Amino acid sequence: ERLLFLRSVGERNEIGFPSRFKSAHYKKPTRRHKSARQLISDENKRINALLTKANKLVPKATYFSVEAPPSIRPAKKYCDVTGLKGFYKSPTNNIRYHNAEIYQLIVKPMAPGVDQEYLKLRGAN
Amino acid sequence: KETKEVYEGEVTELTPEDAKTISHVIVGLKSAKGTKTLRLDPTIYESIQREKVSIGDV
Amino acid sequence: LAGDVISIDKASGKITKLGRSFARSRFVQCPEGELQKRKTVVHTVSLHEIDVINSRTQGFLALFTGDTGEIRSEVRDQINTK
Amino acid sequence: KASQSRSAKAGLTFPVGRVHRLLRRGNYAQRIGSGAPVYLTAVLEYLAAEILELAGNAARDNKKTRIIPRHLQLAIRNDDELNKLLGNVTIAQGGVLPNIHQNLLPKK
Amino acid sequence: RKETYSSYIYKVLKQTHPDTGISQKSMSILNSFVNDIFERIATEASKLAAYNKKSTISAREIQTAVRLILPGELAKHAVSEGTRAVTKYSSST
Amino acid sequence: KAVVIDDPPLRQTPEPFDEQSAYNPQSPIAIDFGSSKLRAGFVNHATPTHIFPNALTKFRDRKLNKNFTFVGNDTLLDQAVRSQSRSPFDGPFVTNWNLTEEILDYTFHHLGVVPDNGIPNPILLTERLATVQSQRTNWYQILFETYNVPGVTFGIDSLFSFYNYNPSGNKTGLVISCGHEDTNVIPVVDGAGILTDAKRINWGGHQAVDYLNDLMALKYPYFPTKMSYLQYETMYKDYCYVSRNYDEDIEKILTLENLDTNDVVVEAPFTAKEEEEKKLKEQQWDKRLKLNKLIKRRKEKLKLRDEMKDRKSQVSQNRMKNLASLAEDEAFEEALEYEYKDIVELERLLLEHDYDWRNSILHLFLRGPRPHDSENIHEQHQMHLNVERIRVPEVIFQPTMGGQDQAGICELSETILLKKFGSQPGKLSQTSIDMVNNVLITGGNAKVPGLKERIVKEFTGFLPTGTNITVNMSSDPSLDAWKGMAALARNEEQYRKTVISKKEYEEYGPEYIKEHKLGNTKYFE
């Protein structure tokens, strides 16, 4: 019953290859997987080709013009271990910490490979 | 009988204008309840510059 | 220089050299605990010092040179109220 | 337009381009990456600095201003990790450590 | 023309000990030492890069080689010095 | 009193089918293809008909029949079918397209539509702000070839919500959208969204839950069980709020008088004569401060013995250098420390007769205001949420904490209202005042508390004094986009202004964009 409960919905919610909701002709084309990282790159090179053709047309609303500009105020500094206000930064692994006992218990005896993951959260590696 | 009038806040804009001799300076102040802009004479501007006031000082 | 022990005040910018640390390669001990400490100091100021300071005709050097010179009673009344 | 070498770009006093030259015509691989000579230069610079530090206080322990391979030999074999690294190597004019087993003393 | 690491070794002991002379025999000992560590690290990196079916020697290959050859304490000091030097070199922006 | 979190319980009832008798071939149909959920429904109704997450999977049987097309709400039936559910979105965009066709066919079958030569109903759709040409080209091709629909329109969900909450169509305001994978700030002048000054921040709910995952993984590296995505999602939903001011809140968040109130505990689910004479002499027998200083000196001697024990330390290195200079010429320390502790106890007893966990900030951060014993099984399966309750929603105000070098939402609102559209710093134009009077917050990620109060407080912070600030907010802010396109279709009759025709598509081609007031714009000038 438990192994046929899924099969009941399977034989209730199916659609065959001659699809009713699709058109009479199909002519389905082939496509690549087209990951989202390279889509930005091909849009950028298309746009750059458009400017280098038109120059030898100011853009108005593109993907790279609507993205937010960097801030003007200085960024606040926080402790990497606790999230509190970071007053000091260790010179070896460049980790901002809060006080002395945080430095003794966590920041000093930490293993290599952990500091890069701590710096990954704010993207500082 | 006397009156005391006080402006106090963060300097967000310090623009002086002339006409070698400045004419007037527009100073913008900001506190936690909002901002307010003022016009000032060059005499007070000389004391402002003497106090070494830049953008971001209270 | 490197090897020195110093105290820095962030608000006023006063830097004082306490000396050199224990490094043979004067001599004081390297401090312990947190770098950023907060200390409470207690000041005992005499009424005559505030009377000299509040009188604008002379500075605090009259506390050392001694020429206070007949401090008026109006500033004494202001100090007594404050 | 003129700029200095890669060594002070990395803040090193050992020659980076010479390490790159020895890596490229040393015939180890047909393609050599960019960051590899800098990493190797830093490693050899740190090892030379540590070895000369140990030779330094070994020579101050003899009250002298010059480095004899006696001092190098001593600074090698009184340190355990350089003992493990340099176990099978013999140093020129080094001698041995002063050691004697416990029962060989005149115990009485 | 012959090549030596004499000037670089010289300035290395001049940061740590300025009033210290050096012997030529000690300089030859040091030169043979650094060349031996160099050939050991290079053959370890080339052997590892051949073992991973890769035609390129990069920083991570000699990173694994330094983890392999050096004992652990001097190993993490060596990779720490190398990582600060490489990250300082890579900031050419 | 600990709270055990779990996966959300399975839905017993499968979703139903709309009746084919009430289907109207000439009615438009509204589809919101969101990144997290799909919102499907007819124009004539005011509530949504179909709500399910935008995900699907394929099952494998022993009997090998290949009859498994489980989409959306049917994945909420068992753990195994749900755990392999795949969404058509990779990042903000859509990469694969066959699974989108499968989801769309599932939606069309559950809408009670019986078509002939493709779908005869006009399609109402949603698209992202300033999308790429590949997404629009593929949407055009897939809709006008796979389904043969007569008419399509494209518009942004935030502008759809702003059209919903003022259906005049010519108002002026500021739209703040907190989406699944992005945060948008769009100003609307006279009912038309000015897309040349809108801004986008690459942060959303997905990055917030992944941030909570990374924080909770780095806080407890020795957790025995592995926590899934939905558990971190429900701790983000239940135990996160926006502080009124972050700087004052982080200072006293670990103090005892605050930590007794806002610390949340989460439990993981799991299944001789000389001796006598000496004693007699002892019985016959500032100084206490000197004895305490001697105890401190004994502690320093124990620290020096520990430094001499560690050979990598400089003290043992100096001792080895002294030994080498002489050559060139730990249980006893523990017993001495025990004897020093006994002497300190004797001094304390003589003063009386004749290292707390409460001062450990790491222990307060880890296990709260309670003492900890690690040998019990129950609190080894436990987490404490003290700083992460306010640290997680703060990233939309400071994106630098999230690794993104972008300005905050308040700074973007500040530069829009104070350095654009004819507004000097100090004097606000009529457009800026009309924008401030009608600030609207929408999006699914607005469910966290304290967002409106924080936005109002900062808006009072940077605006000139006496400016009237009004911020509106929906009761359920995940539904205003679908109700917006329903209000575009049903309420007005100028909806044919925005409709793409098939013959017009074959005249102009894939490279086309309708410059209407509620959608996207042309890439160039």
Side-chain angles (χ1 to χ4, degrees), chain F residues 24-205:
Chain F
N24 178 264
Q26 312 90 347
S27 178
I29 168 67
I31 288 279
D32 194 14
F33 204 71
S35 158
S36 163
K37 295 199 201 274
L38 181 136
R39 303 144 198 145
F42 265 135
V43 163
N44 47 55
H45 278 205
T47 206
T49 67
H50 283 54
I51 299 300
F52 40 80
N54 210 15
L56 82 155
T57 183
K58 220 281 180 185
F59 188 79
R60 193 41 66 214
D61 47 348
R62 307 179 176 185
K63 52 187 192 176
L64 202 48
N65 307 356
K66 306 245 192 270
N67 62 277
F68 315 110
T69 315
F70 291 85
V71 173
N73 221 352
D74 320 329
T75 83
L76 259 286
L77 278 173
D78 200 22
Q79 219 54 45
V81 49
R82 180 145 54 91
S83 312
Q84 334 162 332
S85 205
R86 197 162 66 261
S87 276
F89 277 81
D90 166 46
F93 298 141
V94 191
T95 59
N96 60 333
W97 287 95
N98 202 284
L99 274 59
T100 85
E101 287 168 0
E102 198 161 303
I103 291 188
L104 274 190
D105 293 5
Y106 176 86
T107 315
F108 275 164
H109 189 283
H110 274 251
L111 276 165
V113 186
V114 54
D116 43 311
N117 193 40
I119 294 292
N121 300 272
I123 276 299
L124 279 189
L125 219 31
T126 325
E127 66 165 11
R128 308 196 86 80
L129 164 68
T131 197
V132 292
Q133 191 51 88
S134 161
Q135 280 269 102
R136 191 210 317 278
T137 310
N138 211 334
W139 266 117
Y140 262 129
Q141 183 266 304
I142 207 164
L143 264 195
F144 273 178
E145 302 308 313
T146 325
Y147 302 116
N148 224 18
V149 282
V152 294
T153 68
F154 301 132
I156 323 179
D157 39 0
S158 41
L159 294 188
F160 273 9
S161 60
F162 188 62
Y163 185 77
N164 188 24
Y165 263 53
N166 43 286
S168 166
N170 41 307
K171 304 275 189 253
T172 285
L174 198 62
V175 198
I176 305 179
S177 167
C178 308
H180 192 245
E181 312 222 349
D182 35 29
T183 302
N184 313 314
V185 176
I186 305 175
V188 188
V189 170
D190 211 67
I194 309 301
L195 283 207
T196 190
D197 284 322
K199 294 300 175 193
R200 185 189 91 263
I201 306 169
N202 307 97
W203 197 261

Side-chain angles (χ1 to χ4, degrees), chain F residues 15 19 94 103 122 169 223 239 249 357 378 451 463 473 476 506:
Chain F
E15 73 167 58
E19 272 56 50
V94 191
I103 291 188
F223 218 65
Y239 306 124
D249 265 31
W357 62 265
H378 271 51
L451 195 57
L463 278 182
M473 201 184 178
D476 181 31
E506 291 124 6

Side-chain angles (χ1 to χ4, degrees), chain E residues 2 16 68 91:
Chain E
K2 54 223 179 301
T16 176
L68 256 293
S91 75

Side-chain angles (χ1 to χ4, degrees), chain B residues 30-35 37, chain F residues 426 460-465:
Chain B
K30 181 222 268 171
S31 81
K33 279 287 178 33
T35 86
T37 169
Chain F
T460 320
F462 65 87
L463 278 182
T465 319

Side-chain angles (χ1 to χ4, degrees), chain A residues 10 13 22 60 66 69 71 76, chain F residues 105 110 200 247 407 411 523:
Chain A
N13 282 267
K22 282 170 173 93
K60 182 169 71 74
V66 81
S71 159
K76 309 302 278 302
Chain F
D105 293 5
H110 274 251
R200 185 189 91 263
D247 299 320
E411 201 202 310
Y523 295 93

